[PDB]
Design a protein around this ligand. Structure first.
Ligand SMILES: CC(C)(COP(=O)(O)OP(=O)(O)OC[C@H]1O[C@@H](n2cnc3c(N)ncnc32)[C@H](O)[C@@H]1OP(=O)(O)O)[C@@H](O)C(=O)NCCC(=O)NCCSCC(=O)C(F)(F)F
Ligand SMILES: CC(C)(COP(=O)(O)OP(=O)(O)OC[C@H]1O[C@@H](n2cnc3c(N)ncnc32)[C@H](O)[C@@H]1OP(=O)(O)O)[C@@H](O)C(=O)NCCC(=O)NCCSCC(=O)C(F)(F)F
Lengths: 434, 437
């Protein structure tokens, strides 16, 4: 019931909070930067303040203090569902508080009234070739939508730093509302013979309109979509996509530009693209070893994949050190809905083998699986076999998280992200020599 | 030190590098290089050095050093057009990549190579020709880059299962093609918007990259050709902590292709606090003229400056995250004006500001740096030569910046830098970590 008002009052409490805190500990040390950290992608450096979520290496992600199961229980469900609606999540990430069902409905409704594409985007999408990857299409379409930016106007217009957050809030609501429109058009155009996406039923929830535009009607596939979109929404801020959005948002680029840049990062093979990668490898697996393999043959398939310089897709993590609750959460879902699925059973079998392999191999820090290892198998089951699209789905979810933070970054006037770089030759000089 | 094919040269260079970093890392990987305080975390990583970037290094007191070289030094050492004064961007790219100063031949080969690789796919052209005039030039550029990704050789190869070792090779190809296509793209944007969709003509395999650019832009003055060589050379790289450089670095570390990494960087560059400043300094200067008139007094200037600050606004093209003095790129450009457009009224106003602004900023006590940066002096040079469409200004900066960023991109891959993935913290957790306040 008026998320903008809600924010309007939470803001100054928090501004207060930090100032006083910074006054006290501004110069207090929270860490040490090492030569290896610099060469190792800031591995283990605590270099960002990100509010919407925190990641625990052992326990996983907590969204505003809540774990996945906690959310699963707490957040409002649909009419007669079991899976939490992403609208709730979004309210939670933004507010810090559990939304009521009324609040949740208000969002759905808000996201329905704002879903609307400019024709220039439409045309573009319609002229894209079928050889251009869906993420690229997605990314390029978003960038193009920036002509609609309110923040971009207000800013040129001369707004006060103070009001920045309000513009960003509108840009943010509008993008999340349109994303499914762009995502759906992409699918259709690529996989549905360019058929129309149709309309938004103002009376449905965001996932539900999305699935319609996609042209899927299994009510269970709807529930999946809800779960899918909830769980991929945020993953603290050091992740490539979030960080990107955050780094780019810092220069004051609008939310369209920022999200788009984040998509380019999500699309990397070591990141969100792994969604799709996993699937491709699982398929090729099935071709070779066949539908039902022996643990023994599975091992070698991995033992091979390894001494051959390749990584096992969906396994490993920069931060997590244990099995990702996102993975588990998905597996519980399969267990309740597609337990007899062959692909599913394989994924399941992989779970018992890879970790030991990745343990005797001795390189990976995290021998366990991440969300990526398990999403595709679910999708595929419901008929969405177009694996080059999976990352798009992840992208649409990630907007929830990143944008929720975008508002806060500007509301708290976080400045330009600009660290200092060094050359090896200078680092050597600093230390002495290697 | 030298012969013609960059690729062969690189290939040789590479392994010695790796060995070095390796042993160095062997003795000191655990050797602490610095801090981490609460303030730097909230402060956008200000003052934290936590990134390796080989191509350039910025000294806060002296300015950018290319591969140990300063601008003036590059200014003299680098090869020039047959009959120019200005360094050619091709030479700088070579320097940046190889860490060595190129010969004329060496440069010529680069030009030829960039000429050769210059080709846009139809879909991109279609797309560009279909964009509305209200779609900012930077968005066009960024969306065009992303869509060109259909061509990525690294992407393809990667999917086909190449070895981590070979990665750099495809990135070298993708970068070369991208440096090569950029002007085509940029020119098409300019044409479309300001030249009633006329055609960009063709590439002259014999010309230098900038020359072919100005031709496609429709600019024929040699002085402007010369300005372009300088411009593209000077906005090249600025160590890796700047938004654009860092964004390409971050995205590339994920194995996204160069097209993707670059386009993302473009989105950072388009930020009002970043490359977009180019444009703002000009919009700001225009407004200023309109009010104050042409021959304003220092006192009137000063005041207008104070107005801007009180409106809660920043003086455009002044201040910097790292630099603590006047940017050498600023100076460099002032010298060029001094020599070629000593009496432009706009030029004169920039010069005036130069003597007024830093004192006011000093007085206001906010800015760590009260001196000018590159973006404060670039638009005036363009304007003078007829390129008066300021919304396009950052596009040229972007074309320039592809040189630094792509040069390191190859190196990061060549050197196997991993995924850039830091640790985020919430205020609450941070507090808890400390005691709170
Ligand atoms: C995600 C990941 C890149 C994390 O990077 P990083 O923190 O450097 O891994 P690490 O610290 O455990 O690296 C130690 C070594 O083990 C290797 N390793 C790590 N994970 C794996 C894996 N799943 N399979 C094989 N080798 C692996 C690393 O490549 C590295 O080897 P080398 O020393 O020869 O470079 C890494 O786990 C990986 O490559 N994963 C496979 C990626 C994939 O296809 N799907 C999973 C999604 S990637 C998700 C991320 O963005 C994340 F945060 F996890 F990095
Ligand atoms: C580049 C800049 C963003 C660096 O930011 P930062 O490192 O945070 O500067 P800082 O620490 O000195 O700023 C401290 C205070 O001085 C103010 N200040 C800094 N520069 C200026 C300026 N040019 N005019 C007025 N006030 C300024 C800051 O806004 C800040 O005020 P507050 O604390 O009340 O928010 C900054 O000086 C600025 O805003 N410049 C003007 C931007 C512009 O339109 N053109 C110049 C190109 S920006 C160069 C860069 O480094 C960047 F990375 F941003 F691209």
């Amino acid at each position: 019931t008026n998320l903008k008002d809600v924010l309007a009052s939470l803001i100054p409490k928090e501004q207060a909070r930090i100032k006083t805190f910074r006054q006290q500990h501004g110069n207090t040390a929270v860490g040490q930067i090492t030569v290896d950290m610099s060469y190792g992608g800031m591995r283990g450096m605590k270099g960002l303040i990100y509010e919407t979520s925190v990641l625990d290496p052992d326990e996983g992600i907590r969204f505003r203090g809540f774990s996945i199961p906690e959310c699963q229980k707490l957040l409002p469900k649909a009419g007669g569902g079991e899976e939490p609606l992403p609208e709730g999540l979004f309210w939670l990430l933004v507010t810090g508080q559990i939304p009521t069902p009324e609040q949740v409905s208000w969002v759905s409704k808000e996201w329905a009234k704002r879903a609307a594409l400019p024709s220039h985007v439409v045309t573009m999408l319609d002229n894209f070739p079928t050889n251009l990857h869906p993420m690229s299409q997605l990314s390029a379409a978003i960038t193009a939508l920036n002509s609609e930016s309110n923040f971009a106007r207000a800013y040129a217009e001369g707004i006060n730093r103070t009001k920045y957050w309000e513009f960003v809030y509108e840009d943010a609501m509008d993008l999340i509302a349109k994303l499914p429109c762009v995502a759906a058009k992409i699918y259709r155009n690529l996989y549905r013979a360019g058929s129309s996406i149709g309309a938004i039923d103002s009376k449905l929830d965001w996932s539900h309109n999305f699935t319609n535009m996609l042209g899927y009607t299994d009510p269970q596939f709807t529930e999946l979509m809800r779960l899918y979109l909830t769980i991929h929404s945020d993953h603290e801020g050091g992740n490539v996509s979030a960080h990107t959005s955050h780094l780019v948002g810092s220069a004051l680029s609008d939310p369209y530009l920022s999200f788009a840049a984040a998509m380019n990062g999500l699309a990397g093979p070591l990141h969100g693209l792994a969604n799709q990668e996993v699937l491709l490898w699982l398929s090729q697996l099935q071709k070779d070893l066949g539908a039902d393999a022996s643990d023994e043959k599975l091992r070698d398939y991995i033992w091979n994949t390894l001494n051959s310089g390749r990584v096992v897709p969906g396994y490993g993590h920069a931060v997590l050190r244990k099995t990702d609750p996102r993975y588990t959460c998905q597996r519980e879902f399969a267990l309740k809905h597609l337990p007899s699925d062959p692909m599913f059973k394989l994924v399941a079998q992989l779970y018992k083998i890879v970790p030991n392999v990745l343990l005797e191999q001795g390189k990976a820090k995290n021998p366990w699986p991440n969300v990526d290892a398990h999403s595709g198998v679910l999708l595929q089951y419901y008929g969405m076999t177009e694996m080059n699209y999976y990352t798009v789905l992840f992208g649409v979810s990630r907007a929830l998280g990143v944008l929720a933070q975008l508002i806060w970054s500007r509301a708290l006037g976080f400045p330009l992200e600009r660290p200092k770089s060094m050359s090896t030759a200078g680092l050597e000089k600093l230390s002495a020599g290697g």
